[model samples]
Structures are given as C-alpha cells and as structure tokens.
Target: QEVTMWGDSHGVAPNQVRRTLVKVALSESLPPGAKQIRIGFSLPKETEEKVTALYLLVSDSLAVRDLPDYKGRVSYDSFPISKEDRTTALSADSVAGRRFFYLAADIGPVASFSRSDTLTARVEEVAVDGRPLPLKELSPASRRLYRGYEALFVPGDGGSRNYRIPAILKTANGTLIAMADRRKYNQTDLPEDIDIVMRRSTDGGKSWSDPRIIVQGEGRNHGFGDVALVQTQAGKLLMIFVGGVGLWQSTPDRPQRTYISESRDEGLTWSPPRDITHFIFGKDCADPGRSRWLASFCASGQGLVLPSGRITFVAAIRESGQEYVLNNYVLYSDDEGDTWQLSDCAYRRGDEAKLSLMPDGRVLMSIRNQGRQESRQRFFALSSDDGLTWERAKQFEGIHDPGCNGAMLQVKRNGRDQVLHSLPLGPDGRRDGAVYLFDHVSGRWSAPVVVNSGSSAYSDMTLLADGTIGYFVEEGDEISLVFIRFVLDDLFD
Candidate 1:
C-alpha cells in the first residue's frame, strides 16, 4: 500500500555510487487478510556522512501484483540525521492479496564525492493486521486524515533559505496565506537571493505568523519569484509575482516582469509593488495590436475567482525572441483588483499554470508541460468565456507529471462538485507524491491518494478553516515546506 524509491542521481566521484530501484504498483483492492509491512527513510546530512548502510528489498511485479510473490529484506544502520528511530518492520504471514513491491537499494561501497548526492527509500507505511494501508483506499476519511501532517516550512525555518514556490490562501477572516520562495542563495532558480516569502496561519494550520517580506528582491539583478494569490469579493488581497532578470539572465532587452501586491488587512499589511506590467499585458496600452503583445514573464501558483466575480490568473508568455517559446496566458480581472486583461494564448509549450472555477462556468486550466510539449502529460484547458478565449489544449488524461509545478482547486463538498489536484506524480521522475480527485458530478479522476510516497515538489491547495484540505508542499531536497491536511471525506468515498 505504499512504494517509494528515490535516488537523486549521484555519480561523479567517490567510487561513483550507483544502485537504485523503486518499483511500486499495488492496487487490486488489497484485503485477503493483509498483514503488516513498513519501511522508512530520510537521510541528507550528506547522506548521513557518506552512507554506511541502508537497505529494503521486496520484489514481485507484473506491473504491480497478483500475489504469490516472495522477496524481503530490511536493514538500517546509518544514523545521525538526528535519529528518532528511522523505522523498519515486517510481518506478512504470506503477504496477502493483489500486492506488488520492489525496493532495492545499496549505498556507497565507498566514496570521494566530487558532486552528486541523494538517497531516499520509502514504503514508509503500510499495514494490515496492525491497520494502516494506503496504496488506494478511497477513504473512511483515512482516520481524520492522518492527523494533519504538518511542517509549514522547515530546513532551517525562515532562515536556512530554500523554500521554493508554494501558494495558498484561505482568508476572509479565517486567514491562512502561506506563499513561498525565500531561496536566499542556493536552490538555484533565479539569479539567486530570491524573496517573496510570507506566512500567516491564525491557528488553523496550528500556528504560524512571523516571516513576512511579501516580495523583496533587489539584489542579483532583481529577485522576486513565482508567487500567486487571489481573493476579492470585497476583501481584496490580489498578489501575483515574477520579477525580472534571472532566467539565466533573461533577455529580450532584459524582459521578465509581472508584479502586483495588495492586502486590505486580512493578509495583514502590504502594498508597495505596482508594476502591473502594462496593465496586465497590454504593455503600454496604445492598442497597436495590444502593444505588440511581447511577453517576458508571468507564471506562478494560485489565482481563481470567477463565477462572474472574475479575477483569474495563469500566465507564462515571455515570447520575445522566442527564447524557447513559453506561452500560456489568461490574466483576467473584471474590475476587482482595480483592472487588468489579457487572455487568448492558452497553451503551446506550456509552463506553470493553474486556475479552476468550474461548476459549469468553465475555466479549468492545469498546465505545466515544461518539457516543451510532446506530452509530459498534465496539460488541460477550458475557459468558457470567463477568462476569455481558450479551448484547444489537452493531455491531462489522468495527470502524470515530470515537468513540475501544478495546483488546481474547485471544491464544494457534500453538495458535490470536487476537482482538487496537486502534482508530482512524475511520469519520468519527480517521484510519486499525489493528491488527485475530480468528480464534477462523476466525470471521474481519482486514484492518487498517496501524499508523499517520497520526494515531492511544488504544490499548493487551500480550502481549510476547519473543513480540511490544505496541502502546501515542496518536500525533501526542495528543502521541506509542508502543510498537509485532508478530507472531503479524505478524498471522497
């Protein structure tokens, strides 16, 4: 009911370490008197000082299972990542029904390290007689959603610098805010020294508040970062980001700008960043064909508010000399955040997008095929007249990602109409970490439940004030930034 095998490509020196395997596929609806099994890992203090030993093996796969398999090994002896007992267990009175597992690992026969390091093993938790299972368990509300797995941003807290792109917003008086990308100097995304950081929980995320710089970057050639926030039903809070210089020195005459900041006192104080970038991409507004429509930047997390209350977001245009073509737009605002407009370039070599407001009012964009098209999967588009023009874009056939950065939301619980989705189920490697469910009256899309099978990246979701559902992730090696919470019947039963 769990599978995670991640080894971050380490091979350059130190006896050229290489030995990895993580194959998992188990779901035929386990329960044939299922027994217990557990495996755990987390080591990165330089692989617990050049790896001394760590292993877990279980093999039998015809893609995932059919049972009658045999193979098991459990060994753990390499400590000091500040150990709390890393975990290892087994008990399979003949491992029950429809199962499949494979986790083989061996670290360092010896080393010299010239650069390349990362080792992660997971099968983290799975049980049967002892009661714990999830490879697929549509929900018994998963025991109050595993008591809300927490960690707002750790790895040296607001200081160790390495937070990277996450965005959430729950405020109306139930404040949750979130937003990230402190980076500081080493996670390499911008010119480095990135800033955007924010945090504000007000007791629903279990205590936060204190780490606010909303958007600050003026070193290393202007360093803001991808942060997207939206709210406005009269409680104004629109924030969108992506500042100039650092696409490895962006150039079309140094392009890359898209800024706006506001906070009428719910996110608590902020308002001094106003470069609407030519009033939302009309760029200098003279209508010479919308000012030549030459984008340079715009793409970040959360942004949605339309049932006619319009205020949408999902950008990434930057097409000047076609620096490898990045295009996906819909920067809307029907007189709420003051004014903005730009939509009609919905998908083509997509890159970072998210906006969901579909109860039938349509506006479903969920793109991030950053592999520059050719199907890395995870791509979709709709926008039926709300965000203005966008229809032909597909490939979200059950969402498998590798291009990274995804987030979609459209909840409504009990009254029906759900469509939550966070990414990192990488079809080619970001490591399976899930959160999917789409049942807009049964169009169907669930079968992704596991929230961190191992190594995750860039995520954002929010619908909590106590209704549960607040994934805010970017785990392991992205320098931890979690905030898991669950339910909507723990992803619909």
Candidate 2:
C-alpha cells in the first residue's frame, strides 16, 4: 500500500468541489483469492479540529481523480456525500488493478479557515481481509483548496452580524474596491439598520484594507444597503444605494429614498450621501408616467457604462403598494450622474436585474423569474435603442436561476463578444453557484462553469486592468463574501 500526502484547500480558490485530501493507492497484485481493502486517513491535529467531518472518495475503473480537478467517478453506489467519521473501507471486484482513493473534508465556511494555517493528511490503517498491511510513504504537489480565494468579510466581520449585496469595481489606476451591506441587527434587507462598507485593494485582490463605512444608518427604520457601482468619465466612483423604508412597505408619500455617495479618490473617502430619490421614479419624478413608482432601487452591482459615456442601471420598481408586484426599468444619466431619467418598463414582473453590453452596441438585460413559473429558465430582454425600451421579454431556456441576485460582464475579445454571467444553479433552492459564458458567435450560452457547488446566493464580477477576471460571491446565509480571480483561458482548462 502506498499513500501520497497532499493536504491543502485543493490549490484553487472558490473550488467548491473535487477536494482531494490524501491519495492512497495499492500496487501489489491481489492474491488469487478475493480480499477486502479498506483504508483510513491519518489526519493532523489541526485538521481534525478544524473540520466538522471528512469523507473518503475512491476512483472507479475509469480515471476520475485528476491532480487539480476531480470528475467525481466514485466506485460505491452510496450517496457520494455522507455523514460520519473520517474512516472507510473499499469493497469492490476490481481490487487486482491499482485502486485510487481520496480523502475529503468539510471546513464549514471560508471565514473559519485562516490563510496562515496549514492542513496535512496521510494514510493510516490498511486492512487486507481484516489484517494490517504495511504502507509506502509518498508526497505529491501541495496546493490549498482555498488558495485562489479568500473570505474578505464574514457575518461577524467589522462588528456586523451579516454582510450581503456584493458590489466590486476595478478603477482606472488598477485598484479594486469591494463593497457590501453591513447588516448589523438582522440578516434581512433594509430597513434593518444596515450600513454600506468598502475595502480597497492595491495589489490586485491579494489583500484588502480595513473596512470603512461609506454611509452610516441611523436605526432599523433608517438604514442604507443594496449598493450598485459606476465609474464616471472623470475617473470618479459613484455608489447608488437605497435607504429609509423597506421596499415592500413603502407608500407613495413615504417611499424608500434613493441616495448617491461619491468618492473622487478611488474610494479613499466619500461625499456625504445625498438623496436623489426625486431624480428617480417618485411623486415628484420628472416623468409624470412613472410618478406612481412607490418603491425603487438600483440593482446592487456594477452598473453599465456605454461607449457614449452614458451610465445605465436597471432598477426594480414597484407599481403600487401591492405584494410581489414589481417591474424593472432602465435608469440612465447622460451627465455623469448629475441627473437621471427613466426608460419604458423593461419587465412588468421582474425582480433584481443585471445588464450587459452586446457586440452590436445593444443592451441585454437578464431578469429574475420564479423557477416554478410557466418557464423555469431565466428570462431575458434586449434593448435595441439602448435602455430606452426593451423588446418583449422571453426565456433563455438554457440558463436556470433560483430567483436570486447575479452579475454579468460583457467584454469584446477576439473580434467577438464574450460575456460571463454568474448566478446560483438551483432547481428549487439557492445552491450550486455557477458561471455561464455567452458566446456572441454561437448566440447561445455555454454550460455552467461551476464556481461554488455548495450553498451560494448572490455574486458580482468585474474585469481588472490586465484582463484578469475578478469575482465576488456570498456563500450561504451569515457565512461571508469571498473574492476569487482567474484568467479567461483558465475557464476552458
């Protein structure tokens, strides 16, 4: 019996699957007669306490365990994920050939795993027909599974109980600014005493500065959250968020107010948040047609900036005080956010949205729809005249969303448009975080590139100065927001 020790987070960041702890292999030709082979992992002291549980995964007749990736080709028919100790035995017919086994563990959440800590694993008890067998020692490449990713903030981070609504931006001077809602009292959305916080990164996303409150909230009745970002033509950062009353509980006279907080120094500081609720759809809205928009807020993420220097963002607007009756409208500002205007209704019954630019200079908006609707696929609408008016919305049929917030970024490359869309892949619930690529050539979406296969909810992404992709994700409730980046070519490999 031979054991190869490789204890790490699996070498890649946000690798929610294919965790390989230790690889155990047997090379000896089995005896003429059949025998039972079982092995257990000799986990280190720190690993034993750091993880809640460990699992044993074995390769089948075909090769499933790759150095940096796992295809999940297990031999047993039991639930691949089980509940128990870190020990298990192998009982199979093809014991004569070399059998490969992997040790996997669950570290609960990303925040609990410290970057300075080390994880080590080795193979222990080997049994051949209920008898002990000697083992040969070996070592393989070591890479932590959470290497490429780090939990920038968690629930209890910065004295906040929860942090949600991811918004990230890469400035012109090669700086990354990560923003989110610091939910203090409760995990729910506003108005629940939430504060908008930010952290800046100078050396890519390797490290971040201390959390700074961009905008503070007075109380649960008057809070700010659900932030969206836009970099103006003058290289200034403008974040739009909602404050005061909650969305569902707003009225025409007392609707949730909209505000804008500006930072001219790439997020080093901020201007006092000013109320621009009137510029949007409110009682005194410029457009009388949309004056009845009782509650509205910009979809919290990276807003769109067209070539003409026009800033656009999709806002979820409530027609009245009705429940669950919402619509999406295109909000635009031609003068660098000095004033705002509204487009015709984008969707009559849509929730939070994400917008991306198309190769033809058009706009493609992805709207959230209930998974149990007439069509379970994600709904889409293309605005031919910029964000002025959208064509009749239709289902994409290729991408499936669980009515959760997602992000999109479309950049021209190789004379074609390549768009990366991030969302949760759940048939019913918010789980299985995934990323889909839309190739303008084929005019279709490629299969989901799994990001986090566990419980993930909201996500946002941005393109860095060197063309590197920056991604942010919220894993489960009260867990934390993680930042992971990679090159475009890495998706295929």
lDDT of 1 by residue, 1-493 (tens): 4533223221112222223223344554355565555544444455445444444434334321111111112222221222234555555543334344443333445542211323443344555555555543221100011335555655445454466777888877888888788878677777666888888987777778777777778788678888788888777888878776665345433456677888898788888988777764444654455454555455566788776687878777655454666788788778886778778788877777787777777778887777635556787888688877887544345667788886877777678777878888755777656778777665768777656555677888887766677887776655567776666563446
After superposition, candidate 2 runs with Cα above 4 Å error: 1-147, 393-397, 411-416
Total colliding residue pairs, candidate 2: 6
What's the true lDDT of residue 376 in model 2?
68
lDDT of candidate 2 at residue 63, scale 0 to 100: 29
Which candidate comes out best when scored by lDDT? 2
Flag clash pairs in model 2: 9-144, 9-145, 10-144, 10-145, 11-144, 11-145
Among residues 3 or more apart in sequence or in different chains, the pairs in candidate 1 whose N, CA or C atoms overlap within 3 Å are: 14-111, 14-112, 401-426, 487-490
Task: Give the per-residue lDDT digits (tens) of candidate 2, residues 217-332.
Answer: 99977999999998888788989889988888876678898888788888998888888888877677787876887888888888888878888888888887656678899889
Instruction: List runs of model 1 lying over 4 Å from the truth.
Output: 1-146, 155-159, 162-164, 167-182, 185-192, 195-219, 222-224, 227-252, 257-299, 302-313, 316-354, 364-408, 418-459, 462-470, 473-480, 489-493
- Candidate 2, residue 404: lDDT: 84
